[PDB]
Structure 1
Amino acid sequence: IQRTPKIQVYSRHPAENGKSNFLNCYVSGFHPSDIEVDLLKNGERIEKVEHSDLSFSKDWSFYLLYYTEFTPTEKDEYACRVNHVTLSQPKIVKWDRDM
């Protein structure tokens, strides 16, 4: 069974420009467990990114939370880059303030 990952990019708290926050990328519903997840700032990989411990849901598909501390601004763009065996090329999901 091969399940492609679902991806959500969001902040821990509502985005306030200039105030510290946490940038999250939640990947879930995928199988097998091998996956590469990167957080991007203006298209560039953020180096210091942590992630939760591998777990799975009732249907056996896996989920992971990748997160890093960030200070959002009005100009900076953020995204989450995900590669998986079910994807021919990495998928990039841009961060949206309202999602």
Structure 2
Amino acid sequence: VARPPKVQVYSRHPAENGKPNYLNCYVSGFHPPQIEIDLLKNGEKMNAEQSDLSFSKDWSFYLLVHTEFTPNAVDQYSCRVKHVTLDKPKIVKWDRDH
């Protein structure tokens, strides 16, 4: 069967307003491998880099989408995932406490 993606959105270092950082969207556990993973800044797609397609011992795939960012108090960041298992896109919001 097809397996749905798990999604985590998080920064590489603890977020400090105005301090340069990295924003990660880690997407794992899905099958088939066709997937669309977008990091969004205020709803707008960021030109973020995507890792090479790999998979775990249960054959399910994982991917890391990531880009530089400088968090502040105004901008909202989220990860949007489209996959055959999802009837509408999955959106996970970034927050510095997770």
Both structures adopt the same fold (TM-score exceeding 0.5): yes
- Normalised by the length of structure 1, the TM-score is 0.96
- Which residue of structure 1 lines up, in the alignment, with residue 31 of structure 2? 31
Aligned-residue CA RMSD in angstroms?
0.6
Q: How many equivalent pairs are there?
A: 98
Counterparts of 1:1-99 in structure 2 under 5 Å?
A: 1-46=1-46, 48-99=47-98
Unaligned 5+ segments in structure 2 are: none
Q: 2:5 is matched by which residue type in structure 1? A: P
CA shift for structure 1 position 44:
1.1
Secondary structure in structure 2 of the residue aligned to 1:34: coil
Q: 1:72 is matched by which residue type in structure 2? A: P
What CA deviation, in whole Å up to 9, does each residue of 1:32-67 have, x standing for no partner? 000000011111111x21011000001110000000
- Normalised by the length of structure 2, the TM-score is 0.97
C-alpha distance in structure 2 between counterparts of 1:91 and 1:63, whole Å: 16
Unaligned 5+ segments in structure 1 are: none
4+ long deviations beyond 4 Å: none
